[PDB]
Design a protein around this nucleic acid. Structure first.
Ligand SMILES: [Mg+2]
Ligand SMILES: [Mg+2]
Ligand SMILES: [Mg+2]
Ligand SMILES: [Mg+2]
Ligand SMILES: [Mg+2]
Ligand SMILES: [Mg+2]
Ligand SMILES: [Mg+2]
Ligand SMILES: [Mg+2]
Ligand SMILES: [Mg+2]
Ligand SMILES: [Mg+2]
Ligand SMILES: [Mg+2]
Ligand SMILES: [Mg+2]
Ligand SMILES: [Mg+2]
Ligand SMILES: [Mg+2]
Ligand SMILES: [Mg+2]
Ligand SMILES: [Mg+2]
Ligand SMILES: [Mg+2]
Ligand SMILES: [Mg+2]
Ligand SMILES: [Mg+2]
Ligand SMILES: [Mg+2]
Ligand SMILES: [Mg+2]
Ligand SMILES: [Mg+2]
Ligand SMILES: [Mg+2]
Ligand SMILES: [Mg+2]
Ligand SMILES: [Mg+2]
Ligand SMILES: [Mg+2]
Ligand SMILES: [Mg+2]
Ligand SMILES: [Mg+2]
Ligand SMILES: [Mg+2]
Ligand SMILES: [Mg+2]
Ligand SMILES: [Mg+2]
Ligand SMILES: [Mg+2]
Ligand SMILES: [Mg+2]
Ligand SMILES: [Mg+2]
Ligand SMILES: [Mg+2]
Ligand SMILES: [Mg+2]
Ligand SMILES: [Mg+2]
Ligand SMILES: [Mg+2]
Ligand SMILES: [Mg+2]
Ligand SMILES: [Mg+2]
Ligand SMILES: [Mg+2]
Ligand SMILES: [Mg+2]
Ligand SMILES: [Mg+2]
Ligand SMILES: [Mg+2]
Ligand SMILES: [Mg+2]
Ligand SMILES: [Mg+2]
Ligand SMILES: [Mg+2]
Ligand SMILES: [Mg+2]
Ligand SMILES: [Mg+2]
Ligand SMILES: [Mg+2]
Ligand SMILES: [Mg+2]
Ligand SMILES: [Mg+2]
Ligand SMILES: [Mg+2]
Ligand SMILES: [Mg+2]
Ligand SMILES: [Mg+2]
Ligand SMILES: [Mg+2]
Ligand SMILES: [Mg+2]
Ligand SMILES: [Mg+2]
Ligand SMILES: [Mg+2]
Ligand SMILES: [Mg+2]
Ligand SMILES: [Mg+2]
Ligand SMILES: [Mg+2]
Ligand SMILES: [Mg+2]
Ligand SMILES: [Mg+2]
Ligand SMILES: [Mg+2]
Ligand SMILES: [Mg+2]
Ligand SMILES: [Mg+2]
Ligand SMILES: [Mg+2]
Ligand SMILES: [Mg+2]
Ligand SMILES: [Mg+2]
Ligand SMILES: [Mg+2]
Ligand SMILES: [Mg+2]
Ligand SMILES: [Mg+2]
Ligand SMILES: [Mg+2]
Ligand SMILES: [Mg+2]
Ligand SMILES: [Mg+2]
Ligand SMILES: [Mg+2]
Ligand SMILES: [Mg+2]
Ligand SMILES: [Mg+2]
Ligand SMILES: [Mg+2]
Ligand SMILES: [Mg+2]
Ligand SMILES: [Mg+2]
Ligand SMILES: [Mg+2]
Ligand SMILES: [Zn+2]
Lengths: 83, 99, 124, 99, 138, 208
RNA sequence: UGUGGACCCGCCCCUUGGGGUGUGUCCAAAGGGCUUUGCCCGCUUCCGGAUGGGCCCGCGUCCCAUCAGCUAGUUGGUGGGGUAAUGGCCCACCAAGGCGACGACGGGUAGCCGGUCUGAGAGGAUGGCCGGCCACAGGGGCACUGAGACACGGGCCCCACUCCUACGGGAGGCAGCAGUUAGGAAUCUUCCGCAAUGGGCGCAAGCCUGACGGAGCGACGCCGCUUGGAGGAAGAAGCCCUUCGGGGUGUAAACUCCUGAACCCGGGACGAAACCCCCGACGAGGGGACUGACGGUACCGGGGUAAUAGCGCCGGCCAACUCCGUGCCAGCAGCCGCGGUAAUACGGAGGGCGCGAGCGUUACCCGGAUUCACUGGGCGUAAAGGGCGUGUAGGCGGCCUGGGGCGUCCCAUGUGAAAGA
RNA sequence: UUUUUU
């Protein structure tokens, strides 16, 4: 099943994640389908999260499954906000 | 697109099969001169239509057997044995340069 | 040669033969001594040069040079071969590291102590 | 030592016999049907070709022939029956095949 | 038979200019004629004109040279200092529009044969077309 | 760690006054005063004509030793200058002049180069309100180079800023003397520096 | 039960086995859970998406011609078997074909790429780490189970080895993480942790995870940083040279003053917000609560001591010179060369130059090397015109017009993953 | 006969 998850691209003690569409079977840092945003947990920059919701909205239509942490971040950019 | 080639039939002797010789022009990757390579393809001729010396268009197809992945599309130019005689003579030269 | 010639045959890269058959192309190779000798050099010079026949971990028996004013190397002592040739001695293609297993460093060596393998003394 | 992935191996031999059994039935019935088609009994060959088909599509319901593999044998059977049934044809039952 | 008429014409000019001939003839050809046109436009030759010799057509190339110079070797400076055939038979040279060289940092020309005609290196670049690199002239 | 030892001995070997000593390179004790010849037993012997490499080598040292930097950081700064757009020559100088430890001296906060280094290294220098204790820190145009109010009562600081009264600063710098502030206005130009170093000589040293 | 799908045959449209239609035949399933009248976790058939993959094709892919001929399922055909699926993939029968100098066959070597190093470039070299594909799991063969394997920690068999053995017979398989041994010039801890990310199973809670995140060791590489700063004699001692006047180490030290690496004391993280609970319909949304290896580490505030320097070189290339010692000796040496009584080349000292927590060395790669020359070389005498001819293949092609538009040139577009640069 | 051509 195709999933939406994070991929660690930061350094030692400085993590930077790439919210990413990939098959669950590939490595967590391995090849992926599409880069759909980034996440800075340490919040070091003014913009530490970006999504491109309408792209993330596409993959949820074709059956991508987000992680608990991915869904948490997607909700923060309002992927599910329906008003 | 299915790959398509244009060459000359050099072999009639098989059944339902003709050997098509497709030349190719391209400059040398370093020395830059125009060189002419060529490669024989095993084509499928279901109706035994095409003969020796015919110039035909060949097209990438679902494999018919080993070594046979192309079918004959149409006859471009019919009956020019000079292209065949060029191939035979070179093949005939290999009886020398042995011992 | 013509362009056509180059297409037909093309240049021939010049293969470079190794000057040090210390196999596995190793930076160093250890071996046990066979003989400890003293040999006469080529024409312009004259001296007694201390060398050693060495049976190598590469499966080789070669001559090595003993640097320094004097050595403790004996017939059966084990050593590490360095590489590099003694010019005025024909056939000696490899040196010997001083400061390695059974070859001590040169005593009273005060100038070039990285080579010849000697430690740092004390000044009272 | 002693991983309980051996539980899988124990089940593997269960399913081994199951798949093996159904297949030996498919084959034995198919050869029995095609025997009669070659032997000209139109009704009996048909009454058997039905059960062969039913047994085939039942084997595909599980993990034995799941793919179009079931269709191949179904296809091959109905052809060879109808073909062999062309020797004083008279397709008596006419159940399995189409008009 | 003559092998490369262009190099032959490029040389016929190269040889004539070294002994400071007033004129020289080259066997007439339309492609050659377009080459000579670029040279007469770019000021390397006085010009040219068709002529027959023993009934066969030729092209008189009127060379130009510099001022008679000072002490020893008063021979003038050449207008054509260098000419070299680039894309010869047996090794053809074709360059795209971005591959066209800058000849002598702009002071020279590169005669390009293009689908849009025989152009100098500059004409070919403002036209945005490449092709067969005929020769250097500077 | 950078070079640490006799300094006004290197005033002599370069043949040019090197103000790394701070004061006393101004007073007639620099040993550039009444001893311009190089150090050593043979310093007073007639020097042989320097090779074309000899000149290029000495010119680099004359520049490198002036800022008090190891060759490691020095070379890397050059290779950075060659890639950036502009004249490799001047850009390299502006990069040296952007060193915090060098700006501290240039701002007159410290008497010498080595002294300005220690002031940074011990955290006495402020850059835009934060402490910066790295002498290699590159100052960008517009940054405020101040003194930590923790150190504003230190007698060494009130000493140098006392002689800075009425003293002028480089055209690419400006300083508030009372509040012990400072600002890096712009990258200095070749003309902004009076350094007795031919930069083309140093570039020519690295083409090899 | 027949939504529908499968199969033979016909028809229609497409055009290789794509879609539709008709008759006939064949094919479906499973329950569990509660807040038990309704909802959640599931089940069956079919169509589509998404993702992952199989097979096929053009092209590119190291050396040896002292490998020149190779080939019997080998080349093709018909029919069949097998597969998810084409195919000599296998089988029967028929035809006698298929491949090669444009490098067949054989031999040697080697995972390949993104990239990396080098270089002005073309190019040469390389493929560690990371990312993509492939191949293998002691050697060889084989299938089973499954959507998927011919399966590293699954099975059967042969072989070599190790262990148990009641001699009949069994048990194994670190190229998983550490760790041992051997070989070797040489390569780490039998560490912490489920807190983060990711994966497996489950309604969930949760369980598993040597993937992973962290720590440890090693100057192995990169980078940042300290061994003080300022004042200080026309200039101590000692050592070194000396024209015996003096010169050198050198503001260097002593010593005056300031700062305060270490270290002590206190505070003390970001990385962590969801899963969950509650409201709202188990949705949007809102609200609330638990959750650390690193680690009391990072960092901040206070206190505060002058507190590691080394290595190479100094005859030329190449930057840095004198004295003494030794006398073709002892030795230096990358190359040219030094030493056989004044050696700036040996060995030490003083001094100097170069780098500096590194400095040298050896090996290896590219460079200089235009010394395999595409860019960019040559063959009268320096290395190099074949003894001469004929002529096959191939390479090359005078002038004019016209068609084509393969090479060639231009525009648009798709592709050129990420990292790197 | 050997090194050194000063
Ligand atoms: Mg995968
Ligand atoms: Mg939505
Ligand atoms: Mg609304
Ligand atoms: Mg609404
Ligand atoms: Mg035929
Ligand atoms: Mg066939
Ligand atoms: Mg067709
Ligand atoms: Mg033959
Ligand atoms: Mg050869
Ligand atoms: Mg012996
Ligand atoms: Mg020493
Ligand atoms: Mg189980
Ligand atoms: Mg049976
Ligand atoms: Mg199966
Ligand atoms: Mg550069
Ligand atoms: Mg630019
Ligand atoms: Mg620049
Ligand atoms: Mg520049
Ligand atoms: Mg300015
Ligand atoms: Mg350079
Ligand atoms: Mg129906
Ligand atoms: Mg029906
Ligand atoms: Mg039941
Ligand atoms: Mg069931
Ligand atoms: Mg699809
Ligand atoms: Mg090939
Ligand atoms: Mg057969
Ligand atoms: Mg077949
Ligand atoms: Mg037949
Ligand atoms: Mg070929
Ligand atoms: Mg191999
Ligand atoms: Mg580069
Ligand atoms: Mg290569
Ligand atoms: Mg390669
Ligand atoms: Mg790898
Ligand atoms: Mg195997
Ligand atoms: Mg093994
Ligand atoms: Mg095996
Ligand atoms: Mg399964
Ligand atoms: Mg496998
Ligand atoms: Mg294992
Ligand atoms: Mg074990
Ligand atoms: Mg060992
Ligand atoms: Mg480790
Ligand atoms: Mg689930
Ligand atoms: Mg466990
Ligand atoms: Mg790790
Ligand atoms: Mg004195
Ligand atoms: Mg001082
Ligand atoms: Mg204090
Ligand atoms: Mg946290
Ligand atoms: Mg928080
Ligand atoms: Mg939890
Ligand atoms: Mg409720
Ligand atoms: Mg919510
Ligand atoms: Mg804690
Ligand atoms: Mg503090
Ligand atoms: Mg001290
Ligand atoms: Mg050097
Ligand atoms: Mg010198
Ligand atoms: Mg030496
Ligand atoms: Mg003596
Ligand atoms: Mg002498
Ligand atoms: Mg002497
Ligand atoms: Mg000496
Ligand atoms: Mg010496
Ligand atoms: Mg010294
Ligand atoms: Mg460092
Ligand atoms: Mg080289
Ligand atoms: Mg080269
Ligand atoms: Mg070059
Ligand atoms: Mg060579
Ligand atoms: Mg050439
Ligand atoms: Mg060229
Ligand atoms: Mg040459
Ligand atoms: Mg000769
Ligand atoms: Mg001759
Ligand atoms: Mg000859
Ligand atoms: Mg022509
Ligand atoms: Mg032609
Ligand atoms: Mg075209
Ligand atoms: Mg990229
Ligand atoms: Mg990027
Ligand atoms: Zn000074």
């Amino acid at each position: 099943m195709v999933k939406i998850r994070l991929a660690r691209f930061g350094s030692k003690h400085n993590p930077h994640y790439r919210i990413v569409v990939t098959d669950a079977r590939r490595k967590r840092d391995g090849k992926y389908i599409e880069k759909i945003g980034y996440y800075d947990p340490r919040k070091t920059t003014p913009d530490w999260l970006k999504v491109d919701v309408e792209r993330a909205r596409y993959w949820l239509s074709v059956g991508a499954q987000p992680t608990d942490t991915a869904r948490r971040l997607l909700r923060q950019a309002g992927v599910f906000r329906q008003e | 697109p299915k790959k398509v080639l244009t060459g000359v039939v050099v072999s009639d002797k098989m059944q339902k099969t003709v050997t098509v010789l497709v030349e190719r022009q391209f400059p040398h990757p370093l020395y830059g001169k125009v060189i002419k390579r060529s490669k024989k393809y095993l084509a499928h001729d279901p109706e035994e239509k095409y003969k020796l010396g015919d110039v035909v268009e060949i097209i990438e197809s679902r494999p018919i057997s080993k070594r046979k992945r192309f079918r004959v599309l149409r006859l471009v130019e019919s009956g020019r044995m000079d292209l065949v005689e060029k191939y035979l003579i070179r093949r005939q030269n290999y009886e020398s340069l042995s011992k | 040669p013509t362009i056509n010639q180059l297409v037909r045959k093309g240049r021939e890269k010049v293969r470079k033969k190794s000057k040090v058959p210390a196999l596995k192309g190793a930076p160093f190779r250890r071996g046990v001594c066979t003989v400890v000798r003293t040999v006469t050099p080529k024409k312009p010079n004259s001296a007694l040069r201390k060398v050693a026949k060495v049976r190598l971990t590469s499966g080789y028996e070669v001559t090595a040079y003993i640097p320094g004013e004097g050595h403790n190397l004996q017939e059966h002592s084990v050593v590490l071969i360095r590489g590099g040739r003694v010019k005025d001695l024909p056939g000696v293609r490899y040196h010997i590291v001083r400061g390695v297993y059974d070859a001590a460093g040169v005593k009273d060596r005060k100038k070039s102590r990285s080579k010849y393998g000697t430690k740092k003394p004390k000044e009272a | 030592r002693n991983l309980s992935a051996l539980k899988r191996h124990r089940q593997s031999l269960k399913r081994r016999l199951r798949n093996k059994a159904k297949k030996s039935a498919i084959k034995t019935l198919s050869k029995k049907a095609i025997q009669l088609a070659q032997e000209g009994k139109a009704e009996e060959a048909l009454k058997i070709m039905r059960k062969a088909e039913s047994l085939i599509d039942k084997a595909a319901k599980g993990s034995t022939l799941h793919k179009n593999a079931a269709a191949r044998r179904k296809s091959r059977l109905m052809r060879k029956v109808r073909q062999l049934l062309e020797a004083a044809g008279a397709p008596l039952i006419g159940g399995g095949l189409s008009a | 038979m003559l092998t490369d008429p262009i190099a032959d014409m490029l040389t016929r000019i190269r040889n004539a200019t070294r002994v400071y001939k007033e004129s020289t003839d080259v066997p007439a050809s339309r492609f050659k004629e377009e080459i000579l046109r670029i040279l007469a436009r770019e000021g390397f030759i006085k010009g040219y004109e068709r002529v027959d010799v023993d009934g066969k057509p030729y092209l008189r190339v009127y060379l130009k040279y510099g001022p008679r110079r000072q002490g020893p070797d008063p021979r003038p400076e050449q207008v054509i200092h260098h000419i070299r055939r680039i894309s010869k038979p047996g090794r053809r040279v074709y360059v795209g529009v971005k591959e066209i060289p800058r000849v002598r940092r702009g002071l020279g020309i590169a005669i390009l044969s293009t689908s849009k005609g025989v152009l100098t290196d500059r004409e070919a670049r403002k036209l945005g077309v490449g092709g067969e690199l005929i020769c250097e002239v500077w | 760690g950078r070079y640490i030892g006799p300094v006004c001995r290197l005033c002599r070997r370069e043949g040019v006054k090197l103000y790394l000593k701070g004061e006393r390179c101004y007073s007639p004790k620099c040993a550039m005063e009444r001893r311009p010849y190089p150090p050593g037993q043979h310093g007073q012997k007639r020097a042989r004509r320097p090779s074309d490499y000899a000149v290029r080598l000495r010119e680099k040292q004359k520049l490198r030793r002036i800022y008090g930097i190891s060759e490691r950081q020095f070379r890397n700064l050059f290779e950075e200058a060659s890639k950036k757009k502009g004249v490799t020559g001047s850009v390299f100088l502006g990069l040296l002049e952007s060193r915090l430890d060098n700006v501290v001296y240039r701002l007159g906060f410290a008497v010498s180069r080595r002294q300005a280094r220690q002031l940074v290294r011990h955290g006495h220098i402020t850059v835009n309100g934060r402490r910066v204790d790295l002498p290699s820190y590159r100052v960008r145009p517009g940054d405020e180079i101040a003194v930590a109010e923790k150190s504003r009562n230190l007698e060494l600081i009130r000493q140098n800023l006392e002689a800075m009264k009425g003293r002028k600063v480089g055209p690419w710098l400006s300083l508030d003397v009372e509040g012990m502030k400072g600002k890096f206005l712009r990258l200095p130009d070749r003309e902004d520096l009076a350094l007795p170093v031919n930069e083309q000589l140093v570039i020519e040293f690295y083409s090899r």
